[PDB]
Amino acid sequence: KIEEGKLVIWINGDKGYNGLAEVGKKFEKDTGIKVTVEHPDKLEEKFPQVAATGDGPDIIFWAHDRFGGYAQSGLLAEITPDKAFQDKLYPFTWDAVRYNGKLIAYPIAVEALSLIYNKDLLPNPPKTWEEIPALDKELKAKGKSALMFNLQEPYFTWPLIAADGGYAFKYGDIKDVGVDNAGAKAGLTFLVDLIKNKHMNADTDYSIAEAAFNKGETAMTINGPWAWSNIDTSKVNYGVTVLPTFKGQPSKPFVGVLSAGINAASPNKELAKEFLENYLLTDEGLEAVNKDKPLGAVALKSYEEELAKDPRIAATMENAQKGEIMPNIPQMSAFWYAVRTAVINAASGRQTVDEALKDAQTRITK
């Protein structure tokens, strides 16, 4: 099974594995235990297969929403950090790695959508969703649009739909879904109205929105940290800020948490703990990883306060703190497929907002 006396770690290829390897080397210096960092393809798919037979790595890094399923099959070991260590991280990041009342992973980085705008076209971004329609008619007079973002993916339109009370799964309860309530209804109705009023095209997708924003054709867009390097090149003077409110309520974008779990079949659980707590989860630890590839906003308060000197990161955290922690249950798959269809049918007039959400709700709680 899993080798004893060493630590093998799995992390995705789009992360700072080289930097993580650095922290691993430091661990090896003052312990004698070697740390091997690997980044296989479809690791989020392989882990379940190899762990089920008592194999795989000691530690696995992935978005939190996936750990719920791994825990369900008893693949993840329950972690037990003391109160002292727990206070080192933002409170809400812990609700991301909680399953059935147990901590199943260590929070690392936080990710959420923000509002991105062209400072030259819009020196003062809108703080409200209701003022956007008016803003657009003013920008149209100059041949510009006010807002453009991916309307095809629920992930991108959810922030609006949930602002006034909508939600996926109430902290765990798989039978408590909020996609067809008055809140979600209001938000989606506002979105459809923006489309039927020619303020937005129902076919606008990720690429169309990206190219348009980066070419200065639109004043605003909605995206995550993964899109900043692409905008830095376009030579557009942009800023990142908090998302607009709807009916006075903050937009609720889904929150993604990069987390580190420990294989239940690992004989090196104590070493993994020592590594994650006293080596990786430190200012020097996250710095080594960040230097290789930026993590965005981090769950470690001490280091986050330093990275927040970058307003883009500060905003990302602000939007995540007002966002909804993505449910870590497997039923989340029905949600994506259900809401996706509801938004498409509602936008195309094929179905009414009330009907679309009603059918979505039924499919999720089915």
mmCIF file of C-alpha atoms in Angstrom:
data_model
loop_
_atom_site.group_PDB
_atom_site.id
_atom_site.type_symbol
_atom_site.label_atom_id
_atom_site.label_comp_id
_atom_site.label_asym_id
_atom_site.label_seq_id
_atom_site.Cartn_x
_atom_site.Cartn_y
_atom_site.Cartn_z
ATOM 1 C CA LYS A 1 0.000 0.000 0.000
ATOM 2 C CA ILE A 2 1.161 3.533 0.809
ATOM 3 C CA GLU A 3 4.879 3.695 1.582
ATOM 4 C CA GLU A 4 5.666 4.300 5.236
ATOM 5 C CA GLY A 5 8.215 6.856 6.396
ATOM 6 C CA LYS A 6 7.689 9.379 3.603
ATOM 7 C CA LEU A 7 5.095 11.767 2.186
ATOM 8 C CA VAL A 8 3.725 11.689 -1.345
ATOM 9 C CA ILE A 9 1.589 14.682 -2.346
ATOM 10 C CA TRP A 10 -0.815 15.202 -5.257
ATOM 11 C CA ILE A 11 -1.655 18.663 -6.577
ATOM 12 C CA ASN A 12 -3.016 19.846 -9.916
ATOM 13 C CA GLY A 13 -0.699 21.000 -12.701
ATOM 14 C CA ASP A 14 -2.067 24.561 -12.692
ATOM 15 C CA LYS A 15 -0.741 25.049 -9.153
ATOM 16 C CA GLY A 16 2.661 25.844 -7.688
ATOM 17 C CA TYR A 17 3.871 22.268 -7.260
ATOM 18 C CA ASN A 18 7.463 23.388 -7.726
ATOM 19 C CA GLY A 19 7.055 25.837 -4.875
ATOM 20 C CA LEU A 20 5.345 23.170 -2.798
ATOM 21 C CA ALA A 21 8.350 20.952 -3.506
ATOM 22 C CA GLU A 22 10.483 23.702 -1.978
ATOM 23 C CA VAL A 23 8.524 23.511 1.280
ATOM 24 C CA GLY A 24 8.878 19.739 1.039
ATOM 25 C CA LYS A 25 12.676 20.022 0.833
ATOM 26 C CA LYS A 26 12.714 22.227 3.925
ATOM 27 C CA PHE A 27 10.657 19.617 5.771
ATOM 28 C CA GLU A 28 13.185 16.969 4.739
ATOM 29 C CA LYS A 29 16.124 19.021 6.008
ATOM 30 C CA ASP A 30 15.061 19.138 9.616
ATOM 31 C CA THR A 31 13.278 15.716 9.738
ATOM 32 C CA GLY A 32 15.000 13.315 7.309
ATOM 33 C CA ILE A 33 11.630 12.405 5.748
ATOM 34 C CA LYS A 34 11.436 12.911 1.997
ATOM 35 C CA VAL A 35 8.448 14.613 0.385
ATOM 36 C CA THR A 36 7.507 13.771 -3.198
ATOM 37 C CA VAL A 37 5.196 16.144 -5.062
ATOM 38 C CA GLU A 38 3.320 14.773 -8.061
ATOM 39 C CA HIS A 39 0.747 16.297 -10.411
ATOM 40 C CA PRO A 40 -0.929 13.578 -12.498
ATOM 41 C CA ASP A 41 -3.720 14.226 -14.986
ATOM 42 C CA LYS A 42 -7.294 13.686 -13.845
ATOM 43 C CA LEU A 43 -6.010 13.254 -10.296
ATOM 44 C CA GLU A 44 -9.442 14.235 -8.960
ATOM 45 C CA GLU A 45 -10.617 11.095 -10.796
ATOM 46 C CA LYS A 46 -7.737 8.767 -9.938
ATOM 47 C CA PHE A 47 -7.700 9.449 -6.192
ATOM 48 C CA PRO A 48 -11.113 7.728 -5.685
ATOM 49 C CA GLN A 49 -9.916 4.653 -7.583
ATOM 50 C CA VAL A 50 -6.547 4.217 -5.880
ATOM 51 C CA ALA A 51 -7.664 5.238 -2.408
ATOM 52 C CA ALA A 52 -10.452 2.654 -2.531
ATOM 53 C CA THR A 53 -7.762 -0.065 -2.562
ATOM 54 C CA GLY A 54 -5.639 1.419 0.210
ATOM 55 C CA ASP A 55 -3.305 3.177 -2.226
ATOM 56 C CA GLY A 56 -2.684 6.674 -3.532
ATOM 57 C CA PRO A 57 -0.849 9.685 -2.041
ATOM 58 C CA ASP A 58 -0.764 10.679 1.628
ATOM 59 C CA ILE A 59 -2.057 14.194 0.881
ATOM 60 C CA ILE A 60 -4.325 15.399 -1.939
ATOM 61 C CA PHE A 61 -4.911 19.041 -2.971
ATOM 62 C CA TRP A 62 -8.148 19.966 -4.705
ATOM 63 C CA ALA A 63 -11.176 22.225 -4.657
ATOM 64 C CA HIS A 64 -13.275 21.563 -1.554
ATOM 65 C CA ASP A 65 -16.534 20.734 -3.359
ATOM 66 C CA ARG A 66 -15.001 17.388 -4.324
ATOM 67 C CA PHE A 67 -13.940 16.305 -0.819
ATOM 68 C CA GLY A 68 -17.543 15.708 0.184
ATOM 69 C CA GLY A 69 -17.778 12.672 -2.056
ATOM 70 C CA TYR A 70 -14.386 11.360 -0.968
ATOM 71 C CA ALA A 71 -15.467 11.600 2.670
ATOM 72 C CA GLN A 72 -18.688 9.753 1.916
ATOM 73 C CA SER A 73 -16.637 6.716 0.877
ATOM 74 C CA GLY A 74 -14.353 7.012 3.903
ATOM 75 C CA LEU A 75 -11.331 8.014 1.813
ATOM 76 C CA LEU A 76 -10.384 11.052 3.895
ATOM 77 C CA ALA A 77 -9.039 10.998 7.436
ATOM 78 C CA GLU A 78 -10.685 13.318 9.921
ATOM 79 C CA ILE A 79 -8.264 16.054 10.917
ATOM 80 C CA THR A 80 -8.130 17.429 14.459
ATOM 81 C CA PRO A 81 -6.381 20.811 14.639
ATOM 82 C CA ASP A 82 -6.467 22.534 18.022
ATOM 83 C CA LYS A 83 -8.416 25.742 18.615
ATOM 84 C CA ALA A 84 -5.135 27.695 18.606
ATOM 85 C CA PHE A 85 -4.322 26.640 15.052
ATOM 86 C CA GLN A 86 -7.907 26.991 13.900
ATOM 87 C CA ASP A 87 -7.962 30.708 14.718
ATOM 88 C CA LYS A 88 -5.028 31.179 12.335
ATOM 89 C CA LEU A 89 -7.433 30.875 9.395
ATOM 90 C CA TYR A 90 -10.580 32.755 8.405
ATOM 91 C CA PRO A 91 -13.618 31.204 10.162
ATOM 92 C CA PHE A 92 -15.656 30.651 7.003
ATOM 93 C CA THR A 93 -12.929 28.684 5.247
ATOM 94 C CA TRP A 94 -13.535 25.943 7.834
ATOM 95 C CA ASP A 95 -17.194 25.523 6.863
ATOM 96 C CA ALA A 96 -15.862 24.524 3.436
ATOM 97 C CA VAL A 97 -14.019 21.421 4.689
ATOM 98 C CA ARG A 98 -16.743 20.250 7.038
ATOM 99 C CA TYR A 99 -18.719 17.083 6.335
ATOM 100 C CA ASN A 100 -21.305 15.582 8.669
ATOM 101 C CA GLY A 101 -19.896 17.706 11.467
ATOM 102 C CA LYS A 102 -16.270 16.748 10.942
ATOM 103 C CA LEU A 103 -13.211 18.530 9.590
ATOM 104 C CA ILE A 104 -12.015 16.572 6.549
ATOM 105 C CA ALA A 105 -9.360 18.898 5.126
ATOM 106 C CA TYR A 106 -7.177 21.933 5.594
ATOM 107 C CA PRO A 107 -8.228 25.178 3.812
ATOM 108 C CA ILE A 108 -5.502 26.774 1.676
ATOM 109 C CA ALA A 109 -6.773 29.332 -0.842
ATOM 110 C CA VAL A 110 -10.069 31.122 -1.500
ATOM 111 C CA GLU A 111 -11.507 31.880 -4.910
ATOM 112 C CA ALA A 112 -14.500 33.949 -6.075
ATOM 113 C CA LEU A 113 -15.768 36.073 -8.974
ATOM 114 C CA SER A 114 -15.353 39.837 -8.827
ATOM 115 C CA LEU A 115 -16.548 42.850 -10.834
ATOM 116 C CA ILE A 116 -13.969 43.987 -13.368
ATOM 117 C CA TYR A 117 -14.201 47.367 -15.054
ATOM 118 C CA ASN A 118 -12.430 49.658 -17.506
ATOM 119 C CA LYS A 119 -11.262 52.695 -15.482
ATOM 120 C CA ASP A 120 -11.049 54.888 -18.582
ATOM 121 C CA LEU A 121 -14.636 54.158 -19.639
ATOM 122 C CA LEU A 122 -15.994 53.955 -16.083
ATOM 123 C CA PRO A 123 -14.077 55.875 -13.366
ATOM 124 C CA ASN A 124 -16.819 55.021 -10.873
ATOM 125 C CA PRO A 125 -18.202 51.467 -11.197
ATOM 126 C CA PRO A 126 -21.887 50.856 -10.333
ATOM 127 C CA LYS A 127 -22.623 49.697 -6.795
ATOM 128 C CA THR A 128 -26.066 48.536 -7.907
ATOM 129 C CA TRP A 129 -27.451 46.010 -10.412
ATOM 130 C CA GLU A 130 -30.522 48.191 -10.971
ATOM 131 C CA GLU A 131 -28.499 51.104 -12.332
ATOM 132 C CA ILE A 132 -26.863 49.005 -15.030
ATOM 133 C CA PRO A 133 -29.711 49.228 -17.566
ATOM 134 C CA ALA A 134 -29.515 53.032 -17.449
ATOM 135 C CA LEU A 135 -25.731 52.975 -17.627
ATOM 136 C CA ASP A 136 -25.880 50.817 -20.782
ATOM 137 C CA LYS A 137 -28.190 53.174 -22.683
ATOM 138 C CA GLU A 138 -25.639 55.908 -21.930
ATOM 139 C CA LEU A 139 -22.693 53.842 -23.173
ATOM 140 C CA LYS A 140 -24.610 52.774 -26.279
ATOM 141 C CA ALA A 141 -24.704 56.442 -27.311
ATOM 142 C CA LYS A 142 -20.923 56.119 -27.749
ATOM 143 C CA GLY A 143 -21.049 52.653 -29.280
ATOM 144 C CA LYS A 144 -20.145 50.881 -26.040
ATOM 145 C CA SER A 145 -21.929 48.370 -23.848
ATOM 146 C CA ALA A 146 -21.985 48.454 -20.061
ATOM 147 C CA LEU A 147 -21.771 44.773 -19.126
ATOM 148 C CA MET A 148 -20.747 41.450 -20.682
ATOM 149 C CA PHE A 149 -20.089 38.079 -19.031
ATOM 150 C CA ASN A 150 -20.714 34.354 -19.596
ATOM 151 C CA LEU A 151 -24.476 33.794 -19.502
ATOM 152 C CA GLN A 152 -24.212 30.111 -20.453
ATOM 153 C CA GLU A 153 -22.799 28.893 -17.128
ATOM 154 C CA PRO A 154 -24.831 28.932 -13.856
ATOM 155 C CA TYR A 155 -21.563 29.595 -12.019
ATOM 156 C CA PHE A 156 -21.428 33.071 -13.579
ATOM 157 C CA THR A 157 -25.071 34.094 -13.303
ATOM 158 C CA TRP A 158 -25.660 32.625 -9.850
ATOM 159 C CA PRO A 159 -24.298 35.689 -8.008
ATOM 160 C CA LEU A 160 -27.301 37.663 -9.265
ATOM 161 C CA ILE A 161 -29.897 34.931 -8.971
ATOM 162 C CA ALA A 162 -29.029 34.291 -5.325
ATOM 163 C CA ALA A 163 -28.408 37.870 -4.181
ATOM 164 C CA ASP A 164 -31.969 38.338 -2.878
ATOM 165 C CA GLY A 165 -32.298 35.032 -0.979
ATOM 166 C CA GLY A 166 -31.580 32.183 -3.406
ATOM 167 C CA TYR A 167 -29.272 29.307 -2.453
ATOM 168 C CA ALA A 168 -28.180 25.800 -3.432
ATOM 169 C CA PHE A 169 -28.188 23.482 -0.422
ATOM 170 C CA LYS A 170 -28.784 24.735 3.113
ATOM 171 C CA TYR A 171 -25.622 23.787 5.063
ATOM 172 C CA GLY A 172 -25.796 20.056 4.332
ATOM 173 C CA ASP A 173 -29.552 19.338 4.247
ATOM 174 C CA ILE A 174 -29.842 17.861 0.761
ATOM 175 C CA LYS A 175 -33.613 18.386 0.853
ATOM 176 C CA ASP A 176 -33.419 22.132 1.491
ATOM 177 C CA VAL A 177 -32.839 23.750 -1.907
ATOM 178 C CA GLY A 178 -33.467 27.401 -2.680
ATOM 179 C CA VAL A 179 -33.485 27.743 -6.471
ATOM 180 C CA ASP A 180 -37.213 28.256 -6.883
ATOM 181 C CA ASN A 181 -37.930 30.700 -4.065
ATOM 182 C CA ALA A 182 -38.946 34.370 -4.315
ATOM 183 C CA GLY A 183 -35.302 35.443 -4.087
ATOM 184 C CA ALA A 184 -34.037 33.319 -6.984
ATOM 185 C CA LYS A 185 -37.193 34.230 -8.948
ATOM 186 C CA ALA A 186 -36.541 37.951 -8.548
ATOM 187 C CA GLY A 187 -32.881 37.746 -9.534
ATOM 188 C CA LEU A 188 -33.443 35.605 -12.642
ATOM 189 C CA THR A 189 -36.328 37.854 -13.685
ATOM 190 C CA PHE A 190 -33.949 40.795 -13.563
ATOM 191 C CA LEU A 191 -31.467 38.876 -15.739
ATOM 192 C CA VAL A 192 -34.045 37.940 -18.376
ATOM 193 C CA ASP A 193 -35.270 41.537 -18.493
ATOM 194 C CA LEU A 194 -31.736 42.713 -19.243
ATOM 195 C CA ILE A 195 -31.760 40.362 -22.229
ATOM 196 C CA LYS A 196 -35.198 41.147 -23.640
ATOM 197 C CA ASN A 197 -34.336 44.827 -23.348
ATOM 198 C CA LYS A 198 -31.324 44.413 -25.636
ATOM 199 C CA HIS A 199 -28.893 45.212 -22.809
ATOM 200 C CA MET A 200 -27.397 41.716 -23.149
ATOM 201 C CA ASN A 201 -27.364 38.861 -25.683
ATOM 202 C CA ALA A 202 -28.564 35.449 -24.557
ATOM 203 C CA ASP A 203 -25.775 33.787 -26.527
ATOM 204 C CA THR A 204 -22.891 35.716 -24.988
ATOM 205 C CA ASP A 205 -20.385 33.186 -23.616
ATOM 206 C CA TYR A 206 -16.962 33.247 -21.935
ATOM 207 C CA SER A 207 -14.853 33.919 -25.048
ATOM 208 C CA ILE A 208 -17.182 36.574 -26.467
ATOM 209 C CA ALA A 209 -17.253 38.417 -23.142
ATOM 210 C CA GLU A 210 -13.479 38.145 -22.658
ATOM 211 C CA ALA A 211 -12.537 39.416 -26.130
ATOM 212 C CA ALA A 212 -15.060 42.260 -25.904
ATOM 213 C CA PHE A 213 -13.823 43.465 -22.527
ATOM 214 C CA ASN A 214 -10.161 43.135 -23.453
ATOM 215 C CA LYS A 215 -10.758 45.113 -26.654
ATOM 216 C CA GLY A 216 -12.454 47.954 -24.803
ATOM 217 C CA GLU A 217 -15.878 47.282 -26.336
ATOM 218 C CA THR A 218 -17.537 46.855 -22.944
ATOM 219 C CA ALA A 219 -17.037 48.673 -19.655
ATOM 220 C CA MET A 220 -17.471 45.727 -17.279
ATOM 221 C CA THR A 221 -17.165 41.987 -17.009
ATOM 222 C CA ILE A 222 -17.367 39.356 -14.301
ATOM 223 C CA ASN A 223 -14.473 36.920 -13.856
ATOM 224 C CA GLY A 224 -12.075 35.252 -11.453
ATOM 225 C CA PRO A 225 -8.326 35.594 -10.712
ATOM 226 C CA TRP A 226 -7.570 33.152 -13.522
ATOM 227 C CA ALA A 227 -8.354 35.915 -16.029
ATOM 228 C CA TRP A 228 -6.113 38.715 -14.749
ATOM 229 C CA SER A 229 -2.933 37.805 -16.662
ATOM 230 C CA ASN A 230 -4.998 37.818 -19.844
ATOM 231 C CA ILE A 231 -6.217 41.346 -19.125
ATOM 232 C CA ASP A 232 -2.748 42.606 -18.127
ATOM 233 C CA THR A 233 -1.628 42.014 -21.721
ATOM 234 C CA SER A 234 -4.656 43.563 -23.463
ATOM 235 C CA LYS A 235 -3.343 46.907 -22.244
ATOM 236 C CA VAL A 236 -6.648 47.987 -20.728
ATOM 237 C CA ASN A 237 -6.534 50.039 -17.564
ATOM 238 C CA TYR A 238 -8.715 47.845 -15.338
ATOM 239 C CA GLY A 239 -9.743 47.560 -11.710
ATOM 240 C CA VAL A 240 -11.272 44.780 -9.601
ATOM 241 C CA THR A 241 -13.972 45.539 -7.060
ATOM 242 C CA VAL A 242 -16.911 44.226 -5.066
ATOM 243 C CA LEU A 243 -19.928 42.951 -7.033
ATOM 244 C CA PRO A 244 -23.052 45.137 -7.309
ATOM 245 C CA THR A 245 -26.004 44.726 -4.942
ATOM 246 C CA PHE A 246 -29.526 43.657 -5.939
ATOM 247 C CA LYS A 247 -32.524 44.924 -3.935
ATOM 248 C CA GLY A 248 -29.903 46.158 -1.472
ATOM 249 C CA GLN A 249 -28.548 42.627 -0.977
ATOM 250 C CA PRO A 250 -24.926 41.631 -1.810
ATOM 251 C CA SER A 251 -24.367 39.322 -4.797
ATOM 252 C CA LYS A 252 -23.705 35.735 -3.717
ATOM 253 C CA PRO A 253 -20.974 34.232 -5.875
ATOM 254 C CA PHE A 254 -19.920 30.649 -5.178
ATOM 255 C CA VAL A 255 -16.756 30.326 -3.096
ATOM 256 C CA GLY A 256 -14.075 27.832 -4.086
ATOM 257 C CA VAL A 257 -11.556 26.620 -1.499
ATOM 258 C CA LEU A 258 -8.359 24.841 -2.464
ATOM 259 C CA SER A 259 -7.970 22.265 0.278
ATOM 260 C CA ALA A 260 -5.526 19.611 1.428
ATOM 261 C CA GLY A 261 -6.950 16.292 2.537
ATOM 262 C CA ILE A 262 -5.237 13.316 4.156
ATOM 263 C CA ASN A 263 -5.699 9.805 2.769
ATOM 264 C CA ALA A 264 -7.505 7.643 5.329
ATOM 265 C CA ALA A 265 -5.256 4.739 4.298
ATOM 266 C CA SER A 266 -2.118 6.734 5.001
ATOM 267 C CA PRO A 267 0.240 5.374 7.711
ATOM 268 C CA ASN A 268 1.959 8.771 7.814
ATOM 269 C CA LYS A 269 -0.970 10.794 9.171
ATOM 270 C CA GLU A 270 1.081 12.383 11.959
ATOM 271 C CA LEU A 271 3.782 13.483 9.530
ATOM 272 C CA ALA A 272 1.172 14.919 7.144
ATOM 273 C CA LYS A 273 -0.304 16.928 9.997
ATOM 274 C CA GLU A 274 3.102 18.229 11.064
ATOM 275 C CA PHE A 275 3.811 19.173 7.447
ATOM 276 C CA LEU A 276 0.565 20.957 6.649
ATOM 277 C CA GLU A 277 0.295 22.773 9.969
ATOM 278 C CA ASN A 278 3.842 23.821 10.758
ATOM 279 C CA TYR A 279 5.333 24.008 7.294
ATOM 280 C CA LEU A 280 2.842 24.707 4.500
ATOM 281 C CA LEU A 281 0.316 26.738 6.501
ATOM 282 C CA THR A 282 2.832 29.450 7.450
ATOM 283 C CA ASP A 283 3.837 32.782 5.936
ATOM 284 C CA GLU A 284 7.031 31.264 4.536
ATOM 285 C CA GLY A 285 5.136 28.198 3.345
ATOM 286 C CA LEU A 286 2.433 29.932 1.331
ATOM 287 C CA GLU A 287 5.020 32.399 0.058
ATOM 288 C CA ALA A 288 7.095 29.627 -1.485
ATOM 289 C CA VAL A 289 4.016 28.246 -3.235
ATOM 290 C CA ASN A 290 2.693 31.664 -4.233
ATOM 291 C CA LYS A 291 6.042 32.679 -5.774
ATOM 292 C CA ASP A 292 5.827 29.722 -8.131
ATOM 293 C CA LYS A 293 2.186 30.366 -9.098
ATOM 294 C CA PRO A 294 -0.118 32.856 -7.328
ATOM 295 C CA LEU A 295 -2.792 31.252 -5.145
ATOM 296 C CA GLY A 296 -5.001 34.301 -5.183
ATOM 297 C CA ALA A 297 -6.517 34.901 -1.746
ATOM 298 C CA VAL A 298 -5.352 32.637 1.099
ATOM 299 C CA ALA A 299 -7.112 31.240 4.144
ATOM 300 C CA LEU A 300 -4.154 32.119 6.403
ATOM 301 C CA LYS A 301 -4.962 35.498 7.991
ATOM 302 C CA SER A 302 -1.347 36.546 8.618
ATOM 303 C CA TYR A 303 -0.255 36.074 5.013
ATOM 304 C CA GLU A 304 -3.573 37.221 3.505
ATOM 305 C CA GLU A 305 -3.185 40.608 5.198
ATOM 306 C CA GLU A 306 0.064 41.030 3.275
ATOM 307 C CA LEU A 307 -1.289 39.863 -0.105
ATOM 308 C CA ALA A 308 -4.279 42.215 0.297
ATOM 309 C CA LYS A 309 -1.953 45.128 -0.522
ATOM 310 C CA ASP A 310 -3.002 44.182 -4.004
ATOM 311 C CA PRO A 311 -6.524 45.599 -4.355
ATOM 312 C CA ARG A 312 -7.465 42.803 -6.768
ATOM 313 C CA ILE A 313 -6.817 40.213 -4.054
ATOM 314 C CA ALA A 314 -8.468 42.354 -1.369
ATOM 315 C CA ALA A 315 -11.631 42.456 -3.507
ATOM 316 C CA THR A 316 -11.534 38.758 -4.231
ATOM 317 C CA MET A 317 -11.643 38.091 -0.475
ATOM 318 C CA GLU A 318 -14.389 40.655 0.057
ATOM 319 C CA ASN A 319 -16.580 38.985 -2.581
ATOM 320 C CA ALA A 320 -15.835 35.541 -1.126
ATOM 321 C CA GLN A 321 -16.794 36.693 2.369
ATOM 322 C CA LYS A 322 -20.211 37.698 1.094
ATOM 323 C CA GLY A 323 -20.467 34.687 -1.177
ATOM 324 C CA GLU A 324 -21.967 31.243 -0.788
ATOM 325 C CA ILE A 325 -19.642 28.368 0.051
ATOM 326 C CA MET A 326 -20.152 25.855 -2.735
ATOM 327 C CA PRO A 327 -21.870 22.735 -1.306
ATOM 328 C CA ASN A 328 -19.418 19.832 -1.016
ATOM 329 C CA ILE A 329 -22.042 17.147 -1.610
ATOM 330 C CA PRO A 330 -22.252 15.003 -4.773
ATOM 331 C CA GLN A 331 -25.855 16.089 -5.441
ATOM 332 C CA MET A 332 -24.243 19.303 -6.644
ATOM 333 C CA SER A 333 -24.097 17.661 -10.096
ATOM 334 C CA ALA A 334 -27.887 17.743 -10.461
ATOM 335 C CA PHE A 335 -27.809 21.400 -9.431
ATOM 336 C CA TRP A 336 -25.405 22.454 -12.193
ATOM 337 C CA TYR A 337 -27.382 20.604 -14.852
ATOM 338 C CA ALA A 338 -30.767 21.794 -13.550
ATOM 339 C CA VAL A 339 -30.035 25.530 -13.148
ATOM 340 C CA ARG A 340 -28.127 25.579 -16.452
ATOM 341 C CA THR A 341 -31.275 24.452 -18.257
ATOM 342 C CA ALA A 342 -33.509 26.829 -16.285
ATOM 343 C CA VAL A 343 -31.432 29.894 -17.185
ATOM 344 C CA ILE A 344 -31.263 28.925 -20.871
ATOM 345 C CA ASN A 345 -34.993 28.254 -21.205
ATOM 346 C CA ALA A 346 -35.855 31.425 -19.278
ATOM 347 C CA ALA A 347 -33.551 33.593 -21.402
ATOM 348 C CA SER A 348 -34.833 32.153 -24.696
ATOM 349 C CA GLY A 349 -38.473 32.678 -23.731
ATOM 350 C CA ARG A 350 -38.993 28.937 -24.214
ATOM 351 C CA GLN A 351 -40.186 28.837 -20.629
ATOM 352 C CA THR A 352 -41.199 31.392 -17.996
ATOM 353 C CA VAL A 353 -38.904 32.244 -15.089
ATOM 354 C CA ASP A 354 -41.400 30.794 -12.606
ATOM 355 C CA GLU A 355 -41.755 27.580 -14.592
ATOM 356 C CA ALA A 356 -38.020 27.171 -15.318
ATOM 357 C CA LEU A 357 -36.955 27.485 -11.674
ATOM 358 C CA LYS A 358 -39.863 25.267 -10.588
ATOM 359 C CA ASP A 359 -38.713 22.438 -12.879
ATOM 360 C CA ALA A 360 -35.110 22.937 -11.787
ATOM 361 C CA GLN A 361 -36.058 22.693 -8.103
ATOM 362 C CA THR A 362 -37.944 19.458 -8.783
ATOM 363 C CA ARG A 363 -34.972 17.872 -10.577
ATOM 364 C CA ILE A 364 -32.545 18.754 -7.786
ATOM 365 C CA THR A 365 -34.669 17.496 -4.900
ATOM 366 C CA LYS A 366 -35.862 14.515 -6.950
#
